[PDB]
Amino acid sequence: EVQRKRQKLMP
Amino acid sequence: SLEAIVQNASSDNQGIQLSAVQAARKLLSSDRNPPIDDLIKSGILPILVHCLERDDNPSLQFEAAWALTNIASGTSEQTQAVVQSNAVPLFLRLLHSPHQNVCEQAVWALGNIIGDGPQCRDYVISLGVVKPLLSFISPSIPITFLRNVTWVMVNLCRHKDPPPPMETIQEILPALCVLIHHTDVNILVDTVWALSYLTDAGNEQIQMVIDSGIVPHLVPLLSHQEVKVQTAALRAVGNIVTGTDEQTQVVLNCDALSHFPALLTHPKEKINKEAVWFLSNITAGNQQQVQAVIDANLVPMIIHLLDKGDFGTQKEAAWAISNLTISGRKDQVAYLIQQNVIPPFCNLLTVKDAQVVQVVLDGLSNILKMAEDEAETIGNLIEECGGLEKIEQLQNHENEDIYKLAYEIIDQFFSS
Amino acid sequence: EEKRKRTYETFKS
Numbered sequence: 001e002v003q004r005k006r007q008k009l010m011p
Numbered sequence: 012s013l014e015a016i017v018q019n020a021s022s023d024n025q026g027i028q029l030s031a032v033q034a035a036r037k038l039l040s041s042d043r044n045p046p047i048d049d050l051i052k053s054g055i056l057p058i059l060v061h062c063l064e065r066d067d068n069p070s071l072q073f074e075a076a077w078a079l080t081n082i083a084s085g086t087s088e089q090t091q092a093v094v095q096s097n098a099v100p101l102f103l104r105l106l107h108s109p110h111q112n113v114c115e116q117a118v119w120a121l122g123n124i125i126g127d128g129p130q131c132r133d134y135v136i137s138l139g140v141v142k143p144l145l146s147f148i149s150p151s152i153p154i155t156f157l158r159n160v161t162w163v164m165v166n167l168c169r170h171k172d173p174p175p176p177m178e179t180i181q182e183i184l185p186a187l188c189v190l191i192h193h194t195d196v197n198i199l200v201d202t203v204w205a206l207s208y209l210t211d212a213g214n215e216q217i218q219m220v221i222d223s224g225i226v227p228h229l230v231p232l233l234s235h236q237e238v239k240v241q242t243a244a245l246r247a248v249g250n251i252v253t254g255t256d257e258q259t260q261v262v263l264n265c266d267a268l269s270h271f272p273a274l275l276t277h278p279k280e281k282i283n284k285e286a287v288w289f290l291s292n293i294t295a296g297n298q299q300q301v302q303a304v305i306d307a308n309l310v311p312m313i314i315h316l317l318d319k320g321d322f323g324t325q326k327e328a329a330w331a332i333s334n335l336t337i338s339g340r341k342d343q344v345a346y347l348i349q350q351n352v353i354p355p356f357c358n359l360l361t362v363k364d365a366q367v368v369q370v371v372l373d374g375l376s377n378i379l380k381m382a383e384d385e386a387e388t389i390g391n392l393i394e395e396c397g398g399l400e401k402i403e404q405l406q407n408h409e410n411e412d413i414y415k416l417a418y419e420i421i422d423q424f425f426s427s
Numbered sequence: 428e429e430k431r432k433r434t435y436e437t438f439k440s
Contacts, residue, residue, distance in 0.1 A: 001243070002165055002204050004126035007084035008077055008119060010040045211435060246435070253432050292432045330433065 020058050025068055032062055032074040039081035047085045051092045056082075063101040069110045076105065076116035083123045090127045099124060099135055106143045115156050118144065122163035129170035136179050141167065145186045154195060161190060161201040168205040174212040177219070184209075184223040191228050196237050203232060203243040210250035217254045221261050226251065230262065233270035242282065245274065249289045256296050263293070263300060268307035275312045280321060287316060287327035294335040301339050310350050318355035326367050329359055333374035336381065344381050353378075353389075357398035365410055372405070372416045379424045390424050399425070 012019055012031075019031035035055055039045045050056075055078075062075030083093040102124075105117035121140060125132045144167075147160050164183060167175060174180075183205070190202045206229060209216050220226065232244035248267060252259040274286035290313060293304055304310065317328035332352060336344060359371050375398070379389055393399060406417035430437075 002162065002201060004166060004169065005084050005090070005123045006119075006126075006162070007045070007081045008040055008116075010037075250435060253434055288433070288435075288438055295432045 017053050017055050017058070020055060020062075025071065028062075029068065029071050029074065032059065032071060032078065035059070036074050036078045036081070039078050045081055045085070047082050047089050050078075050082060051089065056092060056096045060096045060098045060101065063098060063105060066108075069108070069113055072105065072108070073110075073112050073116055076102070076113065076120055080116060080120040080123060083120060083127075087127060090124060090131070093120075094124060094131065094134075100138060103138055103140060103143070106140075111153065111156065114147070115159060118147070118156075118159050118163055122159065122166050125163060126166040126169070129173055129175075132167060132170060132175060133173075136167070136176060141179050141182050145182065148186055148189060154198075158195070158197045158201065161198055161205075165201050165205045165208065168208040171212050174216060177215075180209060180216060180219055181223075184219065184225065188223060188225050188228070191225060191232075196240065199232070199235075199237075200239045200243055203229070203240060203247055207243055207247040207250060210247050214254045214258070217251050217258055220251065221258060226261055227265045230265035230267045230270070233267065234273055238279065238282075241274075242285075245282070245285055245289065249285060249292065252289060252292045256300070259293065259296055259300065263303055268293075268303055268309065271307070271309060272312060275309070275316060280324060283316060283320065284324045284327055287313060287324060287331055291327055291330040291334055294331050294338060296338060298338070298340050298343070301335055301343050304335070305343060305346055310347060314350055314352045314355060317352070317359075322362070322364075325359060326364070329356070329367055329370050329374070332356055333370045333377075336374045336377040339381075341381075344378065348378075348382075348389075353392050353398070354396040357393060357396050357401065360398065360401035360405060365413065368405060369410075369412055369416065372402075372413065372420065375402075376416065376420050379420070386424055 016031040016034050019027050020035065022028045035050065039050065059075040059078050062071050065071050079093050079098060083090045099121070102117040102121050105113050108114055121135055125135045144160060144163060148157070164186065167179065167183060187202055187205060190198055193199060206220060206225070210220050229244060229247060232240050233248065235241050235244065248262055252262050271286050271290065274282055277283060290304060290309060293300055313328050313331050316324050317332065320328065335347065356371055356374065360368055362368055375393065379386055382389055402417050402420060406414050406421065408414045
């Protein structure tokens with residue numbers, strides 16, 4: 001269920 | 012300057028270059044759907060890959076790595092753009108940097124690459140990612156970063172075809188024995204999903220997980236406070252009990268069944284469904300395993316879910332009942348009858364799904380054969396709740412399997 | 428010897 005690719009989100 | 016920062020990023024002045032690369036990161040990380048294709052088409056890729064190797068300007072490395080991380084967070088060809096820029100060894104080299112944030116971004120980027128597919132996972136492994144990745148696990152680590160490490164571990168554990176290398180799996184498992192004792196929810200959910208992936212990979216990998224001694228730390232997570240931990244743990248141990256009877260028995264010896272009543276009464280209905288899935292795999296075993304199901308008092312609950320649940324859960328209950336009719340003894344099917352399973356089991360005969368009606372016909376067939384001395388009174392208790400009528404109607408079905416079975420059951424046991 | 432246990436992927440249509 002954990003997403004395989006993940007983009008980095010700005011604070 | 013606004014667009015052609017492709018130029019600014021190739022400046023002698025490291026301030027101009029760093030600002031331009033930070034702007035590229037800005038385009039690739041502020042919004043919902045980053046414009047990865049224009050960035051790749053713009054030729055900023057080789058510049059950012061060069062930036063990865065600039066040990067004198069860690070901020071430049073960090074910005075380039077996070078730009079590339081977001082590029083490789085995209086489509087398959089978008090990830091291959093980063094890979095074929097031949098940057099994976101550079102990230103690997105960045106894993107040894109004396110700056111936490113550079114290590115974190117290198118780990119993140121590699122995780123996105125590994126998560127693409129089995130090919131990229133094996134490639135990244137082959138350049139030696141696992142030992143440096145696993146070294147970061149330390150009691151003196153930031154947690155925001157430990158979570159990224161565990162995420163990358165999950166990506167190492169994925170993609171059943173071909174499964175990850177045996178060497179790498181037995182390298183990872185000690186790290187998971189440490190991480191399963193942690194207190195953070197994110198850490199545990201990722202740890203247990205890693206185990207779920209491994210145990211799904213196949214019986215050999217299941218045996219590696221068993222041999223790591225981690226199953227006794229896994230089973231108690233079935234009745235953990237958080238629902239995510241519970242669902243992932245149920246998935247992992249269900250995958251284990253898919254294997255041989257002796258592997259299944261390791262799970263049962265960790266006293267796994269004592270957790271399930273709570274799972275069978277959990278308000279979330281997918282949890283009921285998967286718990287009865289687990290139980291169906293247990294009743295498919297030997298006689299002692301059926302007896303463990305019985306002695307855990309799970310028989311009335313399974314019959315209850317068979318009676319009153321939705322269709323999705325009733326299917327799984329039907330498998331559990333039929334597999335127990337296949338696997339059980341004299342007194343076990345007798346206990347099942349003493350718990351009054353026949354009426355709800357018969358009422359499923361009228362369902363839209365062909366597999367399930369076939370399953371209940373199989374179970375009934377074996378139940379009549381199982382007790383030939385009550386075969387007359389069993390046929391009567393079936394006919395009591397309308398089961399005879401539904402069987403004679405399924406004798407009128409369009410599927411060969413169903414009507415041939417219905418005719419067969421009516422012939423052997425209904426002299427009437 | 429039929430389908431003894433039932434794998435997780437089988438547990439979806």
